[PDB]
Design a protein around this ligand. Structure first.
Ligand code: CLA
Ligand code: CLA
Ligand code: CLA
Ligand code: CLA
Ligand code: CLA
Ligand code: CLA
Ligand code: CLA
Ligand code: CLA
Ligand SMILES: CCCCCCCCCCCCCCCCCC(=O)O[C@@H](COC(=O)CCCCCCCCCCCCCCC)COP(=O)(O)OC[C@H](O)CO
Ligand SMILES: CC1=C(/C=C/C(C)=C/C=C/C(C)=C/C=C/C=C(C)/C=C/C=C(C)/C=C/C2=C(C)CCCC2(C)C)C(C)(C)CCC1
Ligand code: SF4
Lengths: 221, 66, 160, 42, 73, 742
């Protein structure tokens, strides 16, 4: 098994069972001794998976409108950098069909449902197949593993029926997730330093490599 | 760049890393790496940070002196 | 190990320190008149009185109520002599309070090494009486000598 | 709930509630009937 | 208390200023200010950096009494 | 090995322990048999070392109590920010700081108390505050009440977070003992992450927000027309107009061309002539350098990676011939005793508070702080009192360590043993030093009083008489006055205006700071200070050293840390405990701090504070009478107490009448303390017997049998009321005097 910056303490609990395990834990945050709160190794892996999935959504969602505007696919007024779409009102605001606080309330309610349900699956496995919820609860029974519930709603195409295929797909998911959250951190830092958007940063790097670097950007903007 | 500051900082960092690697300069351990002397990432960061501190001080002193 | 127990004894209320048992400090203390056991207490009293009466004149002359007048040299010096007349008096009372006529000296008869030593005659009625008389004589002599040096012979001085 | 009501029945909490109610009553009386030196109702 | 009352009433009567006692003895700040603070000016000014007068002995005994009152504490 | 060791759900959250008083210990949970139990219930409430013998539960209770204290502090800060947002004249004070008195509290119109709403200025009626929050907010760049409201809401949220964390880290996820004993990681995080990162973030705030807003304010721009602090972040050119180096970005930092940042990072020194405070660029550079020093000072101690230092090895490496084994064994003492850590931290924090008060009076760091005489006096006096209390508590808990946590069978230290072996020499030498200092410091005052009373002013210890000049302090002042010339050529001006020179800063016709002269009076007062400090040290150190045993009571440690006596035997063994030594040292700390604050008040009123005429002359508040009057006790009684009490005894009928009422009430409480201090329990118990008979005659006697207060509790009540009265007296007197005339 390949190991990247593995430690003697880290190898005492990282035995390769979890997907994407390379022994990397210099700080020992997943140590199973004195474990409580949110520092549980299962909770840490679950949070890594959820953060990776959300960042795989976000790293494409924060760069797709800019690419579509450059390609002239759908109108350029909706083609803005990710900080110019009302996320940061000083950076830019777009006039949607609703006030940003009203949209925040709508999002908060919908995700409160869709995420407190997930939290109660984590607390009590299989508890969302019991109570009546619009008749959809039959698809919310889960599989005993909170990060990978499966079922006809979350796994409709039936991908990875085989165990080796499931393990390979889990490894692919965690690796692409880690890359995506690295990309999201890069988006944030490039917005803080340059402030022109990540796709514009890529275009400036492609047009000239020497004049547009991390080194020739410390002047900020 | 290649200026005096670049040369001083590169020399200080390289000298501190060499002193921490080969020289005597460096119950709670566990980090492992591939180099044979056990010069882990923590030792690399420590030597680089100390060399950076020394080089920054030397540069800012020589700038005032001339 | 610099701080030792007092003469190798850890159960005596004291300690041996470089301020206590240095050879130079022990020599200096042993050569003081108060610790000269084999000498007549009259001579040691004379020396002690001379030193103390000599050193007492300065504060009285320089800080007295008449320090800025012509009578600074005499009256303050007289005050110093008066203090000696007080001090010896106190000593005399001590000599009557502590020591009796019929008792011998109460001074220790041993040394640090534990060898037999003749006790000091100072801790006795006759010895302390002789010491007090010598102290009075030395005190008045020292006050007179200080007055003679500063104001009668007119030796040059900084006078503080 | 019984334990919380027992805690509310302990000496400092009950004294605080009673004296706060009394102080509020006296303050409101002094607002509505201020500067009272005599009893003039009779 | 008895001698404070006597001295203040008589020292306001002798000055022909009994209104000061009649208006200031009903509250303790009047006792502190118009009796203790007001009547002690010449007492504490018995000796100053500018000289001294015949009340210097009373100032010295005043401070002596304060000191020996505080020493028993 | 340094991991997060936490056990889940150790204590059940329930109100069952709320319903039972005194649940923490056994002798108290049995129920009250007498009234004394009630007092005991408020005496052992926070003594976690007596409730249980396990260090883990004690440490968890300590951690959650610290969280609750932080929540209370955040609640108090939210209250101050709210009362500065509403019920305040901060916006009015911003326009005219030199003529409008700060105010953040208004009283309600009931029972005639609305007279306390004084005309502070700015179209506002309310209580004038002296906490100096307005100066902090101006130094922070706050120019609106909405910002104060937002800060209050954030502090309320932070208080709720602290309370939730305190509940969570005891009832849900409690740290283990080894988590608390990881002192190396704690020191690293508190030096690099708490102090270093906090200083770096505050330097960033000062550079990006406080500097441009304060530049606009000092330029005469109206506060409502000043650009918002976020506008100077989004627009770098707006900040670049004031400081052109911002046009270069962070490249001068990364290329080590730090001298390009010499427009907002200056080593100027002195005070700002416009505001009378320290330059904010100086504070920004100071906090930046402090952050760098703390961040490189936080990577010292060893952790999971082999680099770093071991505290145990560092301590064990220092041992000399005089001290024998040296500092070996101190690590195990300090890592297994909370009382030793409390003693050390209390002493250090009290000394830090004292030096904070001195350095704030000497260098006002906020705009329009020096010219606010009430704020300066209140801050100095308050932090003096806080420092004295913490220093007393240091010895108070060192005694608890010696009684309870000290044992030589295990956790034996050679240094502590050698200290305890020669304790008689230490106490006797300090006794002689106290006697010598008392004589040659207070007998000089007595001598001056007698010479002045006898009509012999030429025989006193005055400037126009026998002179005791502080040559060393004057030489230090002269050296620090010429520091920019030779020793510190990079500083434009001196570190303060209180050394010397022709410099003088005056804002709005009031003197901010002056070169403070030092003479015979300062000499006498400073040696009085040394005498009082040495006596307090003597009392506290004697209690700490003899808390275990002495020649009188060889088994005093078995009697406990806090016991009344050992009977009338051996001639009387009253107040032999170390608690009584703390109780005695409280009075002496009170005396020392009272003399210190009296010295500060009179010296700054006579030689520093005052008014500047248009011609150029300076007239002080008391006319510079400290040099000739403060050398005698009669001068302190007349020209300081009697003369300056006229502003607090004549405050009736005005807005300062609350200070007169507090003056009288504090005198009353101070007198009331003498009843507990001078009496004894037996007489009060015998009187309570007759009162109990009177109640029993009418069938109204209680089941809880009334008992007189215990001996230790009587002493505690006496000293508490004594300190409260004697401190509130000075509080009211200082506040009324410095608000009416300053
Ligand atoms: C979202 C957070 C996150 C979390 C919870 C995990 C969780 C896990 N990782 Mg994964 N990982 C991540 C991100 C994360 N990872 C990223 C970005 C990478 C690529 C660099 C990897 C690559 C990786 C490897 C190679 C390995 C793991 C492994 C582990 C396991 C042990 C280590 C640990 O306890 O992590 C707990 C971590 C945290 C709580 C995250 C926060 C830590 C601080 C707060 C980060 C601050 C950094 C941020 C950039 C600065 C803020 C700036 C911002 C404001 C702009 C655990 C299952 C081991 C394994 O066995 O896999 C199963 C292993 O060998 N991870
Ligand atoms: C002789 C062969 C040799 C080999 C195969 C490696 C191999 C490795 N070293 Mg080591 N190293 C060596 C000698 C060697 N080192 C020497 C002579 C020095 C100079 C003192 C170093 C200093 C060194 C540093 C400074 C670092 C490594 C690190 C590493 C890894 C990157 C790599 C696997 C990295 C590491 O820290 O390992 C975990 C790294 O940062 N090495
Ligand atoms: C090898 C070349 C080198 C050179 C030429 C200099 C030269 C200089 N350094 Mg030093 N320095 C060096 C190495 C060097 N340094 C290194 C490696 C470090 C990192 C540890 C430092 C850290 C350092 C600091 C932190 C400071 C200097 C300062 C100075 C300048 C003034 C000297 C001084 O402070 O007065 C002599 C001063 C004293 C005798 C007073 C001591 C008071 C103590 C320290 C305080 C109480 C504790 C001078 C130009 C000062 C500066 O740059 O001023 C502009 C400054 O504050 N240096
Ligand atoms: C020695 C005892 C004492 C006495 C007898 C009084 C007497 C009085 N006080 Mg004073 N006072 C005292 C001590 C005392 N005070 C102290 C120690 C303080 C400082 C804390 C004050 C401060 C003070 C204030 C601030 C005020 C008074 C006032 C009053 C008056 C009554 C208030 C009121 O309106 O009641 C109205 C009637 C009642 C509350 C009766 C309640 C009965 C309930 C409703 C039951 C009804 C029965 C069915 C009355 C002259 C008031 C005043 O205006 O004086 C002229 C007022 O404003 N007092
Ligand atoms: C770098 C991070 C860090 C920080 C900032 C702190 C800071 C603090 N710790 Mg220390 N501590 C740390 C690491 C850290 N600690 C570690 C690793 C250990 C274990 C070895 C300890 C062990 C420890 C103990 C045992 C105690 C403290 C206490 C405290 C507080 C005392 C200082 C004070 O109140 O000033 C005022 C400071 C602030 C209000 C500024 C803002 C700091 C924010 C509010 C704190 C968030 C920091 C936290 C460590 C990270 C969040 C965790 C996450 C799960 C939410 C302070 C909040 C004492 C206390 O007061 O506890 C309640 C205490 O009893 N610490
Ligand atoms: C004589 C030299 C000496 C001196 C002058 C000091 C002085 C100081 N130390 Mg101590 N210390 C010493 C020796 C010394 N120490 C040794 C040898 C050790 C190793 C055992 C320690 C361990 C130590 C730690 C681990 C910490 C200090 C801290 C501090 C400062 C306390 C801050 C405060 O006032 O509260 C103001 C508020 C806070 C910031 C402190 C919060 C409360 C702390 C976290 C609790 C102390 C807990 C401690 C680990 C006890 C655990 C008992 C365990 C064995 C069960 C104080 C200035 C603290 C510091 O670094 O502050 C920056 C701190 O975190 N000290
Ligand atoms: C910095 C924080 C600090 C901490 C955490 C502790 C911790 C503790 N102290 Mg130490 N102590 C400190 C500072 C501190 N002390 C200081 C500064 C002093 C000097 C005064 C002392 C002096 C001291 C003594 C003398 C004793 C302790 C003891 C104790 C323990 C129990 C406390 C108790 O039960 O009281 C619970 C709470 C109370 C009794 C509250 C009393 C009310 C106070 C005195 C009034 C304050 C007046 C207020 C401002 C006026 C408002 C008016 C009113 C109407 C509201 C506990 C270990 C005790 C001990 O360990 O016993 C064996 C003990 O004997 N401490
Ligand atoms: C206000 C008056 C007062 C006075 C004068 C004293 C005096 C003294 N206290 Mg006490 N004390 C007091 C109130 C007072 N206390 C109170 C209220 C408390 C309650 C907390 C205490 C509790 C207390 C403690 C707990 C301690 C003392 C100690 C001391 C002694 C140290 C000072 C010293 O020796 O300097 C020299 C003497 C003095 C300044 C006294 C005045 C003498 C003047 C200068 C000269 C008199 C002239 C000369 C003798 C001529 C005599 C004339 C002839 C006819 C006889 C000293 C005897 C400390 C001590 O024992 O240390 C040695 C000590 O630890 N005191
Ligand atoms: C008069 C006070 C005398 C105190 C003497 C204390 C003592 O034993 O001397 C130590 C200190 O000696 C002195 O220099 C005493 C200084 C006396 C003055 C103290 C006040 C500060 C000025 C010895 O140090 P060391 O090098 O043997 O070991 C110290 C430690 O364990 C680390 O090894
Ligand atoms: C691979 C390998 C190798 C090589 C290696 C190398 C060469 C490396 C390098 C490395 C490096 C290259 C490192 C570095 C590091 C660094 C660091 C870590 C730094 C830090 C910094 C700091 C810490 C800073 C600080 C500061 C600031 C921030 C400001 C203020 C001042 C000061 C200075 C303090 C060899 C061939 C041998 C062999 C094989 C293996
Ligand atoms: S008077 Fe009180 S404190 Fe003194 S010995 Fe008797 S019982 Fe103990």
């Amino acid at each position: 098994r390949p190991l990247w910056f593995a430690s003697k303490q880290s190898l005492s609990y990282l035995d390769g069972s979890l997907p994407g395990d390379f022994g990397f834990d210099p700080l020992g945050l997943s140590d199973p001794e004195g474990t409580g709160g949110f520092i549980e190794p299962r909770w840490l892996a679950y949070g890594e998976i959820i953060n990776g999935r959300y960042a795989m959504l976000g790293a494409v969602g924060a760069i797709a409108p800019e690419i579509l505007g450059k390609a002239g696919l759908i109108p350029q007024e909706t083609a803005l950098p990710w900080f110019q779409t009302g996320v940061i009102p000083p950076a830019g605001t777009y006039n949607y069909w609703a006030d940003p606080f009203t949209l925040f309330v709508f999002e908060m309610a919908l995700m409160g449902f869709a995420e407190h349900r997930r939290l109660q699956d984590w607390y009590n496995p299989g508890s969302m197949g019991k109570q009546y919820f619009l008749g959809l609860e039959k698809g919310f029974a889960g599989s005993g593993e909170p990060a990978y519930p499966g079922g006809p709603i979350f796994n409709p195409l039936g991908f990875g029926k085989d165990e080796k295929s499931l393990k390979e797909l889990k490894l692919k998911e965690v690796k692409n997730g880690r890359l995506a959250m690295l990309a999201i951190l890069g988006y944030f830092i490039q917005g803080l330093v340059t402030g022109v958007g990540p796709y514009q940063n890529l275009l400036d790097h492609l047009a000239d490599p020497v004049n547009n670097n991390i080194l020739t950007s410390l002047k900020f903007h | 760049i290649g200026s005096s500051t670049n040369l001083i900082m590169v020399t200080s960092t390289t000298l501190m890393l060499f002193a921490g690697r080969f020289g005597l300069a460096p119950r709670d351990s566990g980090l492992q790496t591939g180099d044979p002397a056990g010069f882990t990432l923590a030792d690399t960061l420590a030597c680089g940070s100390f060399g950076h501190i020394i080089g920054v001080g030397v540069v800012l002193g020589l700038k005032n002196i001339g | 190990q610099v701080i030792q127990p007092l003469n190798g004894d850890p159960f005596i209320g004291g300690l041996e320190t470089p301020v206590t048992s240095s050879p130079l400090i022990a020599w200096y203390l042993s050569n003081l008149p108060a610790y000269r056991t084999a000498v007549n207490p009259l001579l040691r009293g004379v020396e002690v009185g001379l030193a103390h009466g000599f050193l007492l004149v300065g504060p009285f002359v320089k800080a007295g109520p008449l320090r800025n007048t012509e009578y600074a040299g005499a009256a303050g010096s007289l005050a110093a002599a008066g203090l000696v007349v007080i001090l010896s008096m106190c000593l005399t009372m001590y000599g009557i309070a502590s020591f009796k006529e019929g008792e011998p000296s109460i001074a220790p008869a041993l040394t640090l090494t534990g060898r037999k030593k003749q006790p000091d005659q100072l801790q006795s009625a006759d010895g302390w009486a002789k010491f007090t008389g010598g102290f009075f004589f030395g005190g008045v002599s020292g006050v007179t000598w200080a007055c003679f040096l500063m104001y009668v012979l007119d030796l040059p001085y900084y006078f503080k | 709930m019984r334990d919380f009501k027992t805690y509310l029945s302990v000496a400092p909490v009950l004294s605080t509630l009673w004296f706060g109610s009394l102080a509020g009553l006296l303050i409101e009386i002094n607002r509505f009937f201020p500067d009272a030196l005599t009893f003039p109702f009779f | 208390w008895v001698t404070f009352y006597w001295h203040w009433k008589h020292i306001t009567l002798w000055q022909g200023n009994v209104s000061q006692f009649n208006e200031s003895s009903t509250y303790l700040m009047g006792w502190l200010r118009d009796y203790l603070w007001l009547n002690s000016s010449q007492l504490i000014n018995g000796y100053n950096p500018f000289g001294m007068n015949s009340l210097s002995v009373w100032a010295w005994m005043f401070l002596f009494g304060h000191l020996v009152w505080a020493t028993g504490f | 090995e340094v991991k997060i060791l936490v056990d889940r759900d150790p204590v059940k959250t329930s109100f069952e322990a709320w319903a039972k008083p005194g649940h923490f210990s056994r002798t108290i949970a049995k129920g009250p048999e007498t009234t004394t139990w009630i007092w005991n219930l408020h005496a052992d409430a926070h003594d976690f070392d007596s409730h249980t013998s396990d260090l883990e539960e004690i440490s968890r209770k300590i951690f959650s109590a610290h969280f609750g204290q932080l929540s209370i502090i955040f609640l108090w800060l939210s209250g101050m920010y709210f009362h500065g947002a509403r019920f305040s004249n901060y916006e009015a004070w911003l326009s005219d700081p030199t003529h409008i008195g700060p105010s953040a509290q208004v009283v309600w119109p009931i029972v005639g108390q609305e007279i306390l709403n004084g005309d502070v200025g700015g179209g506002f009626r309310g209580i004038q505050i002296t906490s100096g929050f307005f100066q902090i907010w101006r130094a922070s760049g706050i120019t609106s009440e909405l910002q104060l409201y937002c800060t209050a809401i954030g502090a309320l949220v932070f208080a709720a977070l602290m309370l939730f964390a305190g509940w969570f880290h005891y009832h849900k996820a409690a740290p283990k003992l080894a988590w608390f004993q990881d002192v190396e990681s704690m020191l690293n995080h508190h030096l690099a992450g708490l102090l270093g990162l906090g200083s770096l973030s505050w330097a960033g705030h000062q550079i990006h927000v406080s500097l441009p807003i304060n530049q606009f304010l000092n330029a005469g721009v109206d506060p409502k027309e000043i650009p918002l602090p976020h506008e100077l972040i989004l627009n770098r050119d707006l900040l670049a107009q004031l400081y052109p180096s911002f046009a270069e970005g962070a490249t001068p930092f990364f290329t080590l061309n730090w001298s390009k940042y010499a427009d907002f990072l200056t080593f100027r020194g002195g005070l700002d002539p416009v505001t009378g405070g320290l330059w904010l660029t100086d504070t920004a550079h100071h906090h930046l350098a402090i952050a760098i020093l703390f961040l490189i000072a936080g990577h010292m101690y060893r952790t999971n990676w082999g680099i770093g230092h071991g505290l145990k090895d560092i301590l064990e490496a220092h041992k000399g011939p005089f001290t024998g084994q040296g500092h070996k064994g101190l690590y195990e003492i300090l890592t297994t005793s909370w009382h030793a850590q409390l003693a050390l931290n209390l002493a250090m924090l009290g000394s830090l508070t004292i030096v904070v008060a001195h350095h704030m009076y000497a260098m006002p760091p906020y705009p329009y702080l020096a010219t606010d005489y009430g704020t300066q006096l209140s801050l100095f006096t308050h932090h003096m009192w806080i420092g004295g209390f913490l220093i007393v508590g240091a010895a108070a808990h060192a005694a608890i360590f010696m009684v309870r946590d000290y044992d030589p069978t295990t956790r034996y230290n050679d240094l502590l043993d050698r200290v305890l072996r020669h304790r008689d020499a230490i106490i006797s030498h300090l006794n002689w030093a106290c006697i010598f200092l008392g004589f040659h410091s207070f007998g000089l005052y007595i001598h001056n009083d007698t010479m002045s009373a006898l009509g012999r002013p030429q025989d006193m210890f005055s400037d126009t008489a026998i002179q005791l000049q502080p040559v060393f302090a004057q030489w230090i002042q002269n050296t620090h006055a010429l520091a920019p010339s030779a020793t510190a050529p990079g500083a434009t001006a001196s570190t303060s205006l209180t050394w010397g020179g022709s410099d003088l800063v005056a804002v709005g016709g009031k003197v901010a700071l002056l070169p403070i002269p030092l003479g015979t009076a300062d000499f006498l007062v400073h040696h009085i200070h040394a005498f009082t400090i040495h006596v307090t040290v003597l009392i506290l150190l004697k209690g700490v050293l003899f808390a275990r045993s002495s020649r009188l009571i060889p088994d005093k440690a078995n009697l406990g840390f806090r016991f009344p006596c050992d009977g009338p035997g051996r001639g009387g063994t009253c107040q032999v405990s170390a608690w009584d030594h703390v109780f005695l040292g409280l009075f002496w700390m009170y005396n020392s701090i009272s003399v210190v604050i009296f010295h500060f008040s009179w010296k700054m009123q006579s030689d520093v504070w005052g008014s500047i005429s248009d011609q150029g002359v300076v007239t002080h508040i008391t006319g510079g009478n400290f040099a000739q009057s403060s050398i005698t006790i009669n001068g302190w009684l007349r020209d300081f107490l009697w003369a300056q009490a006229s502003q607090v005894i004549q405050s009736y009928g005005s807005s300062l009448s609350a200070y007169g009422l507090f003056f009288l009430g504090a005198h009353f409480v101070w007198a009331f303390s003498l009843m507990f201090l001078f009496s004894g329990r037996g007489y009060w118990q015998e009187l309570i017997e007759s009162i109990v008979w009177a109640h029993n005659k009418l069938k109204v006697a209680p089941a809880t049998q009334p008992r007189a207060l215990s001996i230790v509790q009587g002493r505690a009540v006496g000293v508490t009321h004594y300190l409260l009265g004697g401190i509130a007296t000075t509080w009211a007197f200082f506040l009324a005097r410095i608000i009416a005339v300053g």
